[PDB]
Design a binder for this molecule. Structure first.
Ligand SMILES: CCCCCCCCCCCCCCCCCC(=O)OC[C@H](COP(=O)([O-])OCC(O)COP(=O)([O-])OC[C@@H](COC(=O)CCCCCCCCCCCCCCCCC)OC(=O)CCCCCCCCCCCCCCCCC)OC(=O)CCCCCCCCCCCCCCCCC
Ligand SMILES: CCCCCCCCCCCCCCCCCC(=O)OC[C@H](COP(=O)([O-])OCC(O)COP(=O)([O-])OC[C@@H](COC(=O)CCCCCCCCCCCCCCCCC)OC(=O)CCCCCCCCCCCCCCCCC)OC(=O)CCCCCCCCCCCCCCCCC
Ligand SMILES: CCCCCCCCCCCCCCCCCC(=O)OC[C@H](COP(=O)([O-])OCC(O)COP(=O)([O-])OC[C@@H](COC(=O)CCCCCCCCCCCCCCCCC)OC(=O)CCCCCCCCCCCCCCCCC)OC(=O)CCCCCCCCCCCCCCCCC
Ligand SMILES: CCCCCCCCCCCCCCCCCC(=O)OC[C@H](COP(=O)([O-])OCC[N+](C)(C)C)OC(=O)CCCCCCCCCCCCCCCCC
Ligand SMILES: CCCCCCCCCCCCCCCCCC(=O)OC[C@H](COP(=O)(O)OCCN)OC(=O)CCCCCCCCCCCCCCCCC
Ligand SMILES: CCCCCCCCCCCCCCCCCC(=O)OC[C@H](COP(=O)(O)OCCN)OC(=O)CCCCCCCCCCCCCCCCC
Ligand code: HEM
Ligand code: HEM
Ligand code: HEM
Ligand code: HEM
Ligand code: FES
Lengths: 52, 379, 110, 239, 56, 74, 379, 54
């Protein structure tokens, strides 16, 4: 867990999974915003903010 | 080098029970009511716990605490009436589950059938003690009648009743201990359902033909997870119609009156899912014989394997046994109706003949009819 | 594939709606009930409180002190040194509206 | 002995998705406050419960401030009377049940917070009782302080007829005929028994639409997974 | 077609599938509550507190 | 009891189709309704009769009960 | 023919867990405290359920309900102080059990070690919420301090503290929901202990030498059932000495005073088995840093396998790391003593040095010292 | 009405003051504690109570 995973193939793996990871992070962010009705963020969504 | 779903010790057993379990390809909707029951259990534990966050079991506050839940706790009436009608859904599903077992010969799986009888008794005990918790007129007087039924036991009966009461009558001690037993019992039921499934998976499921189906098994996950989920959605639909459109349909108005030990309700009927047994117990004048008949009306489920004389496991190919089965269902509906009615001229004789038919079908008519069916098939 | 997965995704959207409503209700039940939100929660006072008069109340279980310290007292407790106090505090900082100091009324010793 | 059961009245809230008429709830509170409350309690309803139902907050506060309430001991350890407040529950007409029965001919007037839910027949029953007083029929004699109500079990009620034409004045000018007063108070009593009635019905409508979407789509999901089994063909080719 | 494009862009990848569900769920809660509330307030027009509060 | 050690089967051939190749509700009404009616006809003379007798017993019991509370000229 | 002990599905599980389980022949008395823990758990469920038969969680009656339990319920003082001192015994056994795991490298069993961390947290939550239930001065104000600690959390601290309270402060709703959680949590603890033993039995027990013992395994039943019975009897002796000769040794007199939100006690301390953490949190001036340290002092148990730098598993053959282990135990004792003391000179600097030293030992001194020992052995 | 009756075995010990406020009014602002648990609710117990009284 220090440098056995430190190499060219591992940076390629990182870049390969970065778009999937970032999409999943956006999924988590949107789900967290929607589940909690986080007005801080949600006050910006054009039609959704009508709820507030 | 391995699939975690199969190698990991916890995922191994989850996988073997709910994913890679070989299930018959042809089990029908009547087989959904197992998962429904497991869902009902879970629902009762969830709502109940959230009810337990506000309920207080003192006799000066129990009715008030329930009123507080239904009037001031945010979405407290949702949780309250979800719990109340989920108990009724639990018993609907239980009766359908046991009826399926009787109809298809599932009791031939001895260990799981016996665990199921234990589970039936424990669920009944749980629901009975929980119904006292609101501390309404029906709660109090139903506890009074069904606890006093235990004095009919010879020699040790009165001491047993007074010990269960914690006193001379149903009162504060009874209410607090009933809250404690009601809290703890569903977890014992959870463990017993786990043992139940452990015993069931030793053979897998029976199927509607009553014939072993190892040549046509399918994985549980894609097929019966989605089938069980749709069954759960339908159960939720019925439960939510009850909760959100007729919350009080399956209840008695007199439990909205606080308990009054000096004023007996003109009628004292237990919950509907006890009424058949109530009717059975009211059929025979003797106290002790009445109690013994009430217990036998459920202990008789332990006799189904010994009373099986048919060459075929299921009643799919047994027209006369189906006739008798639906007579038994109609007779149980008759006993429920009769137990909901006063003890008066027509209902006494109706309930008496209904109780006699209840036992005479299971113990007498069903085995003889199966023997006749055997001979009609030249075996 | 689009027809099938469209069915699945619409199913998921409806299930997410239902789950959010259920979980929100169960979370909100643990949130302060309407009786809690209507008791000590707030207690607007009235102009009944006269000058330099401790009209007393029972909010939050705590007896509430409401006085109208008239000029001098305020200034006197500005004249009252901060370092001399055991609990270093400034009079104006204690009373946001100098004219009226509002302290919960209870001795802070046994 | 047979009993007379209440007919079914077309309450505006009878329908599956039909809410209560909140103007009838407001007039019904006026009826309770001015008629019933001298002898009946509503322990589980407070003035704050009226806000956003039949009264605004200022209006309900003035309604609370119209009464006086006893508050916890003062410094001297004496009780005292203070104006009502929104978080106060409806005043109890009698100090204890025994004084309640003493003020009657020995009868307890029930708490009305749940009377609609605690009776078979509900609002229909309460409307029938309030409007159903008549002189007893030949062969029937009642003791002193009892009144023949063919809808009350036993047909001998200790409550005298409480409502009559012009028993109160309604603030919207609604004529106070006996049946108008009874309808209003029975609406208010249904609300008092079930303050969640309207919200429960709105949630029921939402559940019905969500189910009318989810059940077909999950059924389609099950049949998509199961089509592999439902259409497969078997062939037996023994040697 | 519309559903082919839908699958190609928003459904094929599971993470994009989940994102579509999350955004759809947000907008569905908004729209379905708005529509069902309008239906319930039209069924009960003139009876609700919102309908009559404007006089008190 | 796991897949691979359940039974011995020989000479049985299964043909299956992907769910993405087939319809989920094929002939749902033109064929489903005749099958529902066939199943109903197959089970009705074994299920219905006891519930008919229950309806009769309920009707008679309720009616007789309400006639036993009526007044008699005696 | 079969031996039903080995063939029966339930008895097979029991047989493999406690009868025919191969166990190391040399595990010491320190390996007894597992079986003590599971016994303590059972005792807590047994007495608590009997307390819950009389206890009521309304703030107007909770303290009175407990006085009634100890004064009028038959042997209710026995059940009550058995429950309180059994909580203390639970934590004694837990601390000894975790210390054994640390000393002998038992944390190299990753899954059962991590489940044990979960169990430690859940037992702590259960004991904390149970101590509020008598609604004494210490109950109320300890709940007040410990729950308002959570306001230090950024952006959601106040909202989550108020949600846990169900109100603006610790009050009636908090007490009732704490009773509900206190009831339910030990059964989740039971499930986690079962998972814990499932993960342990995958490899079996470690032994004091730290060397794999498969060549010298003995059956569990005759040897460790009798040894665990002797250990249980000794534990019962200590517990009953507490219950019958100094019932109030490990408690606080201020909880015999009913909760007074107007008056606060001069000293607000947790129970003894929280003081080491209460010291650490109190050492840091920053509210949030203090809370993070109070959490890291128990989360750091998750780091032990990654901190292991020795070629050997246990501490049996490493004098220098034994020295550090006993320094760690002494530092935990001094943290407990500091947490029982006021925040004034000199206990502040002592608590600071002890709080630094705890982490400096676990995170730094122990790894470097294992490396030094490695080189002293020329590997 | 509420009445006055002779005490009984099942009756608890009489309270000198109707509420805490009357107790504090009678004792110069101080509420005299309940003595059911006074020995248990003090550090030092009956030793403390003896030394306090003497
Ligand atoms: C037209 C109106 C009358 C219909 C005919 C009724 C009749 O005489 O025979 C019923 C006809 C003949 O039954 P069968 O095919 O010989 O045996 C059915 C299998 O046992 C079981 O076969 P299955 O599992 O394929 O049956 C599914 C069926 C039945 O599902 C259930 O019975 C389970 C749900 C509880 C009972 C619901 C009763 C309504 O579901 C429904 O009919 C209702 C769909 C919605 C609920 C969720 C399923 O059976 C059905 O249509 C199902 C009976 C219950 C529903 C009616
Ligand atoms: C009471 C407590 C709560 C109980 C909850 C429910 C428990 C059971 C849950 C069972 C379950 O999830 O699925 C069983 C069961 C499985 O049915 P299936 O997968 O269509 O298999 C039908 C057979 O192959 C037999 O197919 P077939 O020969 O009858 O013709 C095809 C098909 C279509 O034909 C018909 O059903 C005729 C419909 C004419 C209208 O039949 C059905 O769909 C029968 C059910 C109709 C409803 O589901 C239903 O019975 C349908 C539920 C209703 C549809 C969803 C909502 C709209
Ligand atoms: C003579 C000098 C004074 C007494 C001994 C002082 C001392 O440090 O002895 C350590 C010495 C143990 O040194 P060790 O053999 O390297 O430790 C092995 C383990 O203690 C495990 O050895 P074990 O499984 O044979 O059981 C002995 C163990 C038993 O520990 C327990 O039962 C748990 C005690 C805490 C609860 O207790 C001790 O070793 C420590 C003393 C516990 C309190 C007395 O204790 C004994 O020889 C046994 C106790 C003799 C008492 C007399
Ligand atoms: C961090 C994730 C968002 C938490 C949060 O506050 O969500 C907003 C929502 C609603 O808040 P909001 O969006 O109106 O404003 C957020 C500001 N604070 C946090 C100060 C209230 O929060 C909640 O619903 C509960 C708190 C978070 C629970 C997790
Ligand atoms: C009206 C009551 C409900 C009737 C539902 C339809 C019905 O019962 O049809 C008969 C059905 C046939 O099922 P099958 O397995 O094909 O049996 C062989 C038939 N020749 O028989 C069955 O499906 C019987 C299954 C029993 C399910 C539980 C019922 C008992 C519990 C009642 C409470
Ligand atoms: C304890 C008092 C007795 C004592 O310390 O005995 C020392 C003895 C040595 O045991 P041994 O396994 O032989 O270690 C190698 C010794 N050269 O025994 C030991 O060192 C064993 C003691 C460590 C393992 C058992 C658990 C001890 C827990 C102590 C309190 C922990 C508190 C929480 C810590 C986190
Ligand atoms: C706590 C309530 C119960 C739960 C959660 C439960 C759960 C289950 C589940 C999930 C199944 C497998 C799916 C199915 O076939 O339904 C099952 C099957 C079974 N249950 Fe139950 N059950 C309960 C009560 C009972 C009762 C009361 C009995 C009757 C004595 C019983 C006897 C059986 C039998 C015999 C089977 C096998 C049926 C077959 O395969 O044909 N169970 N149970
Ligand atoms: C086997 C599962 C359960 C069943 C069948 C069951 C059944 C019932 C029933 C019938 C009632 C009376 C409902 C009414 O008021 O009309 C009730 C009440 C109650 N139950 Fe349960 N229950 C279950 C599980 C639980 C659990 C696990 C808890 C505690 C965590 C719980 C807590 C309560 C409480 C507090 C009440 C009183 C408040 C109320 O009336 O709703 N229940 N239960
Ligand atoms: C609910 C409380 C707990 C119970 C009932 C429990 C139960 C047990 C039992 C019976 C054993 C086997 C006997 C023994 O070696 O002592 C065991 C072993 C073990 N437990 Fe626990 N335990 C609990 C909490 C913990 C905690 C807090 C930890 C540490 C974080 C932990 C980690 C372990 C480890 C590592 C072992 C294996 C020890 C070895 O074989 O050397 N457990 N536990
Ligand atoms: C994990 C096991 C448990 C622990 C560690 C635990 C801990 C505690 C503690 C420390 C107290 C305060 C004792 C005192 O008054 O000084 C307490 C009180 C209480 N516990 Fe538990 N408990 C456990 C399990 C249970 C269970 C399972 C129940 C219910 C079935 C229960 C019911 C009670 C009750 C009713 C009280 C209040 C009575 C009293 O204060 O003595 N406990 N618990
Ligand atoms: S602080 Fe008021 S008494 Fe010392």
């Amino acid at each position: 867990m220090l440098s056995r995973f430190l190499g060219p193939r591992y940076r390629e793996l990182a870049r390969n999974w970065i778009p999937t990871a970032s999409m999943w992070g956006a999924v988590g962010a949107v789900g967290l915003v929607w589940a909690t009705d986080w007005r801080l963020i949600l006050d910006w969504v054009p039609y959704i903010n009508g709820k507030f | 080098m391995t699939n975690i779903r199969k190698s990991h010790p916890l995922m191994k057993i989850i996988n073997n029970a709910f994913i890679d379990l070989p299930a018959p390809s042809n089990i029908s909707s009547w087989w959904n009511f197992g998962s429904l029951l497991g869902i009902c259990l879970i629902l009762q534990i969830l709502t109940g716990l959230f009810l337990a966050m506000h309920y207080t079991s003192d006799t000066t506050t129990a009715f008030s605490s329930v009123t507080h839940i239904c009037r001031d706790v945010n979405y407290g009436w949702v949780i309250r009436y979800l719990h109340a009608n989920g108990a009724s859904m639990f018993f609907i599903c239980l009766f359908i589950h046991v009826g399926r077992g009787l109809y298809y010969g599932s009791y031939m799986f001895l260990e799981t059938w016996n665990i199921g009888v234990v589970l039936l008794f424990t669920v009944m005990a749980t629901a009975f003690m929980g119904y006292v918790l609101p501390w309404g007129q029906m709660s109090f007087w139903g506890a009074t009648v069904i606890t006093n039924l235990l004095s009919a036991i010879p020699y040790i009966g009165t001491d047993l009743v007074e010990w269960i009461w914690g006193g001379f009558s149903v009162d504060k001690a009874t209410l607090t201990r009933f809250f404690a037993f009601h809290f703890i019992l569903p977890f014992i039921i959870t463990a017993l359902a786990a043992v139940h499934l452990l015993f069931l998976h030793e053979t897998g499921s029976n199927n509607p033909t009553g014939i072993s189906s190892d040549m046509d098994k399918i994985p549980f996950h894609p097929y019966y997870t989605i089938k069980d989920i749709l069954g759960a959605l339908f159960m939720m639909l019925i439960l939510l119609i009850l909760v959100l459109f007729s919350p009080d349909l399956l209840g008695d108005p007199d439990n909205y009156t606080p308990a009054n030990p000096l004023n007996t309700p003109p009628h004292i009927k237990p919950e509907w899912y006890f009424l058949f047994a109530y009717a059975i117990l009211r059929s025979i004048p003797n106290k002790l014989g009445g109690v013994l008949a009430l217990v036998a009306s459920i202990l008789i489920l332990i006799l189904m394997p010994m009373l099986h004389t048919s060459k075929q496991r299921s009643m799919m190919f047994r027209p006369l046994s189906q006739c008798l089965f639906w007579m038994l269902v109609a007779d149980l509906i008759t006993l429920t109706w009769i137990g909901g009615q006063p003890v008066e001229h027509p209902f006494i004789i109706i309930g008496q003949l209904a109780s006699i038919l209840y036992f005479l079908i299971i113990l007498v008519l069903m085995p003889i009819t199966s023997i006749i069916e055997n001979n009609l098939l030249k075996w | 594939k689009g027809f099938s997965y469209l069915i699945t995704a619409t199913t998921t959207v409806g299930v997410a709606y239902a789950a959010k409503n259920a979980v929100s209700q169960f979370v909100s039940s643990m949130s302060a009930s309407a009786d809690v939100l209507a008791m000590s929660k707030i207690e607007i006072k009235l102009s009944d409180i006269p000058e330099g008069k401790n009209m007393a109340f029972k909010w939050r279980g705590k007896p509430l002190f409401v006085r109208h310290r008239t000029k001098k007292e305020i200034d006197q407790e500005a004249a009252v040194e901060v370092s001399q106090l055991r609990d270093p505090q400034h009079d104006l900082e204690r009373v946001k509206k100098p004219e009226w100091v509002i302290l919960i009324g209870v001795c802070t010793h046994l | 002995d047979l009993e007379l059961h209440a007919p079914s009245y077309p309450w505006s809230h009878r329908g599956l998705l039909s809410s209560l008429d909140h103007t009838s709830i407001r007039r019904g509170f006026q009826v309770y406050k001015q008629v019933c409350s001298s002898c009946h309690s509503m322990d589980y309803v407070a003035y704050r419960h009226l806000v956003g139902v039949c009264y605004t907050e200022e209006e309900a506060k003035a309604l609370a401030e119209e009464v006086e309430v006893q508050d916890g001991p003062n410094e001297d350890g004496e009780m005292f009377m203070r104006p009502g407040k929104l978080s106060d529950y409806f005043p109890k007409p009698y100090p204890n049940p025994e004084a309640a029965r003493a003020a009657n001919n020995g009868a307890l007037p029930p708490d009305l917070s749940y009377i609609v839910r605690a009776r078979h027949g509900g609002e229909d029953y309460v409307f029938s009782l309030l409007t159903g007083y008549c002189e007893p029929p030949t062969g029937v004699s009642l003791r002193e302080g009892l009144y023949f109500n063919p809808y009350f079990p036993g047909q001998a009620i200790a409550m005298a007829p409480p409502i009559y034409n012009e028993v109160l004045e309604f603030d919207d000018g609604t004529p106070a005929t006996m049946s108008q007063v009874a309808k209003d108070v029975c609406t208010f009593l249904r609300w008092a028994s079930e303050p969640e009635h309207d919200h429960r019905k709105r949630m029921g409508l939402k559940m019905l639409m969500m189910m009318g979407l989810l059940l077909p789509l999950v059924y389609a999901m099950k049949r998509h997974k199961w089509s592999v089994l439902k259409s497969r063909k078997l062939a037996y080719r023994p040697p | 077609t519309l559903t082919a494009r839908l699958y190609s862009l928003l459904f094929r990848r599971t993470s994009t599938f989940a994102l579509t569900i999350a955004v759809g769920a947000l907008f569905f809660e908004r729209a379905f509550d708005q529509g069902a509330d309008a239906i319930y307030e039209h069924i009960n027009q003139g009876k609700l507190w919102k309908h009559i509060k404007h006089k008190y | 009891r796991e897949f691979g050690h359940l039974t011995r089967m020989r000479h049985v051939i299964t043909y299956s189709l992907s769910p993405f190749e087939q319809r989920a509700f094929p002939h749902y009404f033109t064929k489903g309704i005749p099958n529902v009616l066939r199943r109903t006809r197959a089970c009705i003379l074994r299920v219905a009769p006891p519930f008919v007798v229950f309806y009769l017993v309920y009707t008679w019991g309720t009616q007789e009960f309400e006639k036993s509370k009526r007044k008699n000229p005696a």
